[PDB]
Design a protein around this ligand. Structure first.
Ligand SMILES: Nc1ncnc2c1ncn2[C@@H]1O[C@H](COP(=O)(O)OP(=O)(O)OP(=O)(O)O)[C@@H](O)[C@H]1O
Ligand SMILES: Nc1ncnc2c1ncn2[C@@H]1O[C@H](COP(=O)(O)OP(=O)(O)OP(=O)(O)O)[C@@H](O)[C@H]1O
Ligand SMILES: Nc1ncnc2c1ncn2[C@@H]1O[C@H](COP(=O)(O)OP(=O)(O)O)[C@@H](O)[C@H]1O
Ligand SMILES: [Mg+2]
Ligand SMILES: [Mg+2]
Ligand SMILES: [Mg+2]
Lengths: 173, 512, 458, 460
């Protein structure tokens, strides 16, 4: 799992993208790179023991509609170190870094009942009090809560479900 | 899954331009500092074994050349360094001041004066790492190196160009024996070098004081790497001393180098290796620890006169040079099975074993005759000493065996009794006090008295006083013969008759 | 200005901006709840990461705490104001008295004195204990080491040395409690204060309950103070409670710092860590430090690398043994391993040397007879081997001595034996002039007089 | 052209990268310019795309990353045949005696397969050393291997020198001497001994000395063995003297650590037995010719039990195990009759007289060893008369083993002695059956012949 080796490439690529302001374009470039890594015929090649130069240039020939100067050179660095499989994780961490820089957050709202638009509106306002970032609410419907709303801002969770209140009470006794 | 010094701003630099410009391959930047090892990024042209210059006036040795990294060890106080400092590779391997003017000085392993007597008056510089003379450039060792201790000079001869291991436990007299051997060369024409690895500084001050009380200091170079100095300096300290010894060897002169605690060098190379993350071996020592001591000790050689003429470009003709090595090793409670002792025992030309059970029973110096051997043989002795010493070695081994056998048996037989109380008396005879080295005439005289049975009727406690009285009597009455033996080492029926007369006249007319 | 980014045991990693990264051994500072925590920098890693040892409890640290960069090493109070007081590794007062009114503070990381600055002395400094002086004489301005396993008396022997040496010493002294029992230090402090000698002793305590960083750097702090009193031109007595713990703290930290193990699981830099501390506790042409160091040996193994490398750094080494303590013989010094650099005919005189070598020769012969005694018993010995055994047993018993600090155990009154008395006694025993007394007469008696007197009492 | 580049330099191990098409094979050889000097590399492993891990055949100092490397498309090949006689060469087959070029007509590769099973030969022609204990307890055939097992300073070099004098002069054929990890002083001594003996012109010498890098010492033996195989395939009978096999394995251990091989027991390489077997199997006598081999092996700490001495025991026909204990007591040669033997000591091969004499000596000595311990407790006072005769015979027999060597006259002053097989069988049978206890114990010591033993007793 490449969670720990993806950070340097994500950070460096994001800083360079910021200096040249084409952050959205860089995200497109990385999305394209992540999808070619999932291909059945490429995922076989990436596991073979080819020398980095040959392997990279095959990938670069396949990777049309990227910028030679910058994006394809990121590809070269990752090929040297044998880390092209880190691209599906470098993409996620680049998106995280962008969300942090743009002071914008994505959070999930979960309930057994489909929420009314006024409920979602007040949720967004309250969350923007709790969180400095603006919030994009994601609606998930799950009968598990049985009632109430589960607020899931990533690792930070506020539980407002009856079932949670019940299984919390059961351990008090 | 691990990083490899791929870090954010370096990656951003490569993102801007993958084929980063040539710039200078001469220079780079420190990226890590720890325990005296630094990692450098850049230095595309750094050679393996090359000196890297650091801010201030400090250096490092490039030991690991890896894929976009150099591992280097710092030859001094490292803790002042920091990440992001620039460094430049020299063109230079490590070299040290060398010459005749080093005699009487105390220097560190970089050759800087440490005694405070002012700057050096050396004769140029020599490489610390160098190759030994080849097979066709050697000559057989035949001249003696006179130690001054009866047991050593009789049973375990040391010749010019020999490598003789001194091995034993802590506090067994190893340092004292070596330094007394230096003192005996005070008037021998052999230059002496004492290199001290990992010892505490005041001990070095104390031995230099003893070397200064006697006249030996004006004939020796002292090279010091104290316990506070970095492992690189301790590890490189023996080779600098060897590079100073090779100056005299390559110019047709004789030198004696005393490496002190070569084991405290091996610990240092181990520290460097494990800090540089190389694969460990037995007792966690690096695999190439044999190669370290092997390429150090093989520099001790005798070189033929044609090599000396070829080297000195004909300035010195017809004289062989020599470098004699006396390494010192410490055993953990005497177990020869340990890795470093077994390697150094494999490399050397002989072994002097010093035992604490002998040292505790009054037998000082505590050399064990049964397990101590010399490969050169009597070929490194003067001929008078050769005759007399031959019998001594066998007699001592056989005496030990007989002593055990006949004591627990609590028994007697006539010839065995005679042999046993001759062996006890010669064993008592080889005891000797510190800083009292004997000339070859004195040694041969006492050994003649022992071999020819004049001690057969002296009681054991009076052997020492017998020896002292004999030496004083001879030093007043028969000095021309002592001068002749000391000048020639010859042995004739005339010499034997005169020695017989001396012993007869002494034992009749004197008392002890 | 910095953030905590990893927390492994007692080791803490902190990230700093690339232009602001700390130097090695700089001191950092963190709020740990309502506490203040000091971190000492050990290594600079790549990318502004810096790796440190917590000088305090690591519990309660989150990631992401702000760390403040104090741009200097750990610095401690120093000089005449530090006298009669008890202090932390960080130089903080640990007694309940007020602030230490120090005029000066020194960094605990310093370079050792030059070879040109050193000094040598042959002056015998008499210690009351009979065995130490005869077998291993110790000179003023030198190093003495007490080697022993667990519970063999290397603390108590040092308290007798403190009592006897303080008789003829006038100047100041420093005591470093490194990784030992708190109770020993508390008892010591109250003995010092109840005898009004505390006004001349400075104490640093880093005892065995404290986290690894404290126990590692407490020793260096004590050396800083001893070096101040040396550099004022005085002569100083420095007592180290246990130097073994200092190497063991480095062992405890070493693997967490990312270093491959060496020999029996030790840190690869062991010899340099020991040497870099040992070379600055030394005398100079301006003043002299006299030091006694207790050296614990693990599992009674005198060949273990830590005790083994400690042997080389000392002038007089006294080796205690459990086998002798189990026989009742205290102080349990082994005469066949205890040694001194000062036992020379020139330094101590021919009588002092001849008596010691006779004692060693007789005892060494006693050892070689033990196997035949074990298998066959004493009646199969030679008629003078029996005499050797008798004199060796008498000598073994006369090495024993009552201590003024052992009255709490033995109940017997203590004894002080001067040099012109013990060598007379041993020379007489060796020559057989006192051979007629029984073995028990020599147990726990001060002088030969007390032995013959005790024989009159059977 | 040069097609590869150095990517790492770690001690004796050099990493080289080539284009993925032209990757050199295992045990191929590469060449690079280190400063002013040509350095040879030998390929050990192919790892990843285009990279070979290699061992340097010279000093590693001065190598940079990015140096060009050229792939010589063959293993290291050395000059063989008549042109090598009287010359000293290194691992690469270059001349180190300063007499000029070798002037060879053929060059062979030092890596090759062993003779086929079908090609081996069986013969049991006995050879006479003139040395009592060896001729008695470990008789040599022709074409077999002889191991001299010993720790430091027990007589391996003196025995090898005396054996060279006795066997080589009578051999009337070529010989090869291989110095593996040998002291340079002793190499010079041997060279001057051979030229003063005027036998140098029938011996070829290969030296890789202690100071040399691990690559040199590792491959030196294979060079000498390749020369011996060249002489064998011409149809000749040759002697191969190898001065220590242990440091072949030890150079292998130093190399193995850095090759990335996972360590094995006692710190040895995983491949120890494989490497030893690949060397020893080439040293045989085939239907076309015969190699006769004498090998010294260092046993660390006299252990005799650690893997390197253990593995080497299997390969040898004749085994002589020198013991520190016998040498320490002052008796030479230090051969232990209770651990030394040859597969030629067969009553069919040697004959009844020889066999039952040797086996009787060995039986006597074992009984002596059993009595020896409790003699310390009992003296000879509580021993029985049956014990007293046996101990007398055993003690004097042990002294009769001791022989002065022509080599060892330097150490001893006494002339070297020569004893024939029939003679020493007579003498040991003479104390076996004749039991000439008339004579003092030292009359059996270092005398050589039976006649000289009784004459020494007649003199004292
Ligand atoms: N011939 C001798 N007679 C008396 N004392 C001696 C003699 N040789 C050495 N000594 C004494 O032995 C003691 C130890 O000396 P030395 O330091 O040389 O020993 P060592 O085995 O080299 O110890 P270490 O490895 O600890 O330095 C000293 O007190 C020295 O005076
Ligand atoms: N002179 C003595 N007479 C009697 N007992 C003694 C003497 N010296 C020491 N002991 C015994 O040793 C015990 C422990 O003493 P001490 O603290 O000095 O030992 P230690 O080896 O330093 O132990 P530790 O490392 O656990 O502190 C004492 O309580 C006492 O029983
Ligand atoms: N036959 C012998 N006669 C006399 N000395 C011998 C004999 N064999 C061995 N030695 C002694 O062994 C030492 C040299 O032996 P050598 O064979 O060179 O050592 P190794 O066995 O380690 O190669 C010297 O002390 C030499 O006198
Ligand atoms: Mg010493
Ligand atoms: Mg205690
Ligand atoms: Mg040899």
């Amino acid at each position: 799992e490449f969670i720990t080796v993806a950070r340097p490439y994500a950070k460096a690529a994001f800083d360079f993208a910021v200096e040249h302001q084409s952050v959205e374009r860089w995200q497109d470039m990385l999305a394209f790179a992540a999808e070619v890594t999932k291909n059945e015929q490429m995922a076989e090649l990436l596991s073979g023991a080819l020398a980095p130069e040959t392997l990279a240039e095959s990938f670069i020939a396949v990777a049309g509609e990227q910028l030679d100067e910058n994006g394809q050179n990121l590809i070269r660095v990752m090929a040297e170190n044998g880390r092209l499989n880190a691209l599906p994780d470098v993409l996620e961490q680049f998106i995280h870094l962008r969300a942090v820089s743009e002071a914008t957050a994505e959070v999930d709202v979960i309930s057994a009942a489909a929420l009314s638009e006024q409920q979602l509106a007040k949720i967004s306002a309250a969350m923007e009090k709790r969180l400095s970032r603006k919030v994009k609410l994601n609606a998930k419907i799950d009968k598990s809560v049985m009632a109430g709303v589960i607020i899931r801002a990533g690792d930070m969770v506020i539980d407002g479900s009856v079932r949670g209140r019940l299984e919390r009470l059961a351990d008090v006794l | 899954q691990l990083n490899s010094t791929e870090i954010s701003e370096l990656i951003k630099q490569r993102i801007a331009q993958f084929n980063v410009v040539s710039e200078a391959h001469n220079e780079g930047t420190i990226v890590s500092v720890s325990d005296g090892v630094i990692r450098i990024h850049g230095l595309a042209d750094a050679m393996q074994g090359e000196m890297i210059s650091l801010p201030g006036n400090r250096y490092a040795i490039a030991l690991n050349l890896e894929r976009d990294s150099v591992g280097a060890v710092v030859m001094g106080p490292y803790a002042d360094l920091a990440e992001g400092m620039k460094v430049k590779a020299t063109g230079r391997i490590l070299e040290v001041p060398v010459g005749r003017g080093l005699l009487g000085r105390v220097v560190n392993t970089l050759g800087a004066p440490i005694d405070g007597k002012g700057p050096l008056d050396h004769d140029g510089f020599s490489a610390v790492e160098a190759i030994a003379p080849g097979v066709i450039e050697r000559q057989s060792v035949d001249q003696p190196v006179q130690t001054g201790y009866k047991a050593v000079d009789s049973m375990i001869p040391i010749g010019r160009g020999q490598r003789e291991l001194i091995i034993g436990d802590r506090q067994t007299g190893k340092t004292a024996l070596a330094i007394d051997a230096i003192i005996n060369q005070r008037d021998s024409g052999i230059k002496a070098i004492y290199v001290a690895i990992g010892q505490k500084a005041s001990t070095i001050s104390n031995v230099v004081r003893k070397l200064e009380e006697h006249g030996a200091l004006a004939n020796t170079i002292v090279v010091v790497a104290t316990a506070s100095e970095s492992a690189a300096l301790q590890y490189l300290a023996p080779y600098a001393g060897a590079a100073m010894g090779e100056y005299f060897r390559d110019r047709g002169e004789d030198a004696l180098i005393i490496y002190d605690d070569l084991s405290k060098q091996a610990v240092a190379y181990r520290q460097i290796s494990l800090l540089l993350r190389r694969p460990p071996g037995r007792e966690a020592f690096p695999g190439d620890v044999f190669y370290l001591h092997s390429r150090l000790l093989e520099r001790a050689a005798r070189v033929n006169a044609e090599y000396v003429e070829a080297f000195t470009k004909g300035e010195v003709k017809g004289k062989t040079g020599s470098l004699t090595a006396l390494p010192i090793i410490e055993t953990q409670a005497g177990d020869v099975s340990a890795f470093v002792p077994t390697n150094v025992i494999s490399i050397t030309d002989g072994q002097i074993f010093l035992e604490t059970n002998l040292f505790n029973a009054g037998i000082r110096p505590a050399v064990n005759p049964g397990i101590s051997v010399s490969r050169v043989g009597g070929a490194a002795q003067t001929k008078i000493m050769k005759k007399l010493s031959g019998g001594i070695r066998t007699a001592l081994a056989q005496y030990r065996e007989l002593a055990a056998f006949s004591q627990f048996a609590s028994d007697l037989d006539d010839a065995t009794r005679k042999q046993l109380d001759h062996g006890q008396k010669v064993t008592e005879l080889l005891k000797q006090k510190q800083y009292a080295p004997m000339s070859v005439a004195q040694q041969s005289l006492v050994l003649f008295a022992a071999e020819r049975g004049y001690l057969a009727d002296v009681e054991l406690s009076k052997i020492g006083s017998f020896e002292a009285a004999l030496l004083a009597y001879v030093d007043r009455d028969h000095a021309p013969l002592m001068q002749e033996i000391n000048q020639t080492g010859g042995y004739n029926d005339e010499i034997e008759g005169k020695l017989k007369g001396i012993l007869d006249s002494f034992k009749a007319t004197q008392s002890w | 200005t910095g953030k905590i980014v990893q927390v492994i045991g007692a080791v803490v990693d902190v990230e700093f901006p690339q232009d602001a990264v700390p130097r090695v051994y700089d001191a950092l500072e963190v709020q740990n709840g309502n506490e203040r925590l000091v971190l000492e920098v050990q290594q600079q890693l790549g990318g502004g990461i810096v790796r440190t040892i917590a000088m305090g409890s690591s519990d309660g640290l989150r990631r992401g705490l702000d760390v403040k960069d104090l741009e200097h090493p750990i610095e401690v109070p120093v000089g005449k104001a530090t006298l009669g007081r008890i202090m932390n590794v960080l130089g903080e007062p640990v007694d309940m008295k007020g602030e230490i009114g120090e005029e000066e503070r020194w960094a605990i990381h310093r370079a050792a004195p030059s070879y040109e600055e050193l000094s040598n002395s042959q002056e015998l400094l008499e210690t009351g204990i009979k065995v130490i002086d005869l077998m291993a004489p110790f000179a003023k301005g030198g190093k003495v080491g007490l080697f022993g396993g667990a519970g063999v008396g290397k603390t108590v022997n040092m308290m007798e040395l403190i009592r006897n040496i303080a008789i003829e010493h006038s100047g100041y002294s420093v005591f470093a409690g490194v990784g030992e029992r708190t109770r020993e230090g508390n008892d010591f402090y109250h003995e010092m204060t109840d005898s009004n000698v505390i006004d001349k002793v400075s104490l640093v305590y880093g005892q065995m309950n404290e986290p690894p960083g404290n126990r590692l750097r407490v020793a260096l702090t004590g050396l800083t103070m001893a070096e101040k009193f040396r550099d004022e031109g005085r002569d100083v007595l420095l007592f180290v409670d246990n130097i073994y713990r200092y190497t063991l703290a480095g062992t405890e930290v070493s693997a967490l710092l990312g270093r491959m193990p060496s020999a029996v699981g030790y840190q690869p830099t062991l010899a340099e860590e020991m040497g870099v501390l040992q070379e600055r506790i030394t005398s100079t042409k301006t003043g002299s430090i006299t030091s006694v160091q207790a050296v614990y040996v693990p599992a009674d193994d005198l060949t273990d690398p830590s005790p083994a490398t400690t042997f080389a750094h000392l002038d007089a080494t006294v080796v205690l043994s459990r086998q002798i303590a189990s026989l009742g013989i205290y102080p349990a010094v082994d005469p066949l391993d205890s040694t001194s650099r000062q036992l020379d005919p020139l330094v101590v005189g021919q009588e002092h040397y001849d008596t010691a070598r006779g004692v060693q020769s007789i005892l060494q012969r006693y050892q070689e007879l033990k196997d035949i005694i074990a298998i066959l018993g004493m009646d199969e010995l030679s008629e003078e081997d029996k005499l050797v055994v008798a004199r060796a047993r008498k000598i073994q018993r006369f090495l024993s001595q009552p201590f003024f600090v052992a009255e709490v155990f033995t109940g017997s009154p203590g004894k002080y034996v001067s040099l012109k008395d013990t060598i007379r006694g041993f020379k007489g025993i060796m020559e057989g002039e006192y051979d007629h007394l029984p073995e028990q007469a020599f147990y726990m008696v001060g002088s030969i007089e007390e032995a013959v007197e005790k024989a009159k009492k059977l």
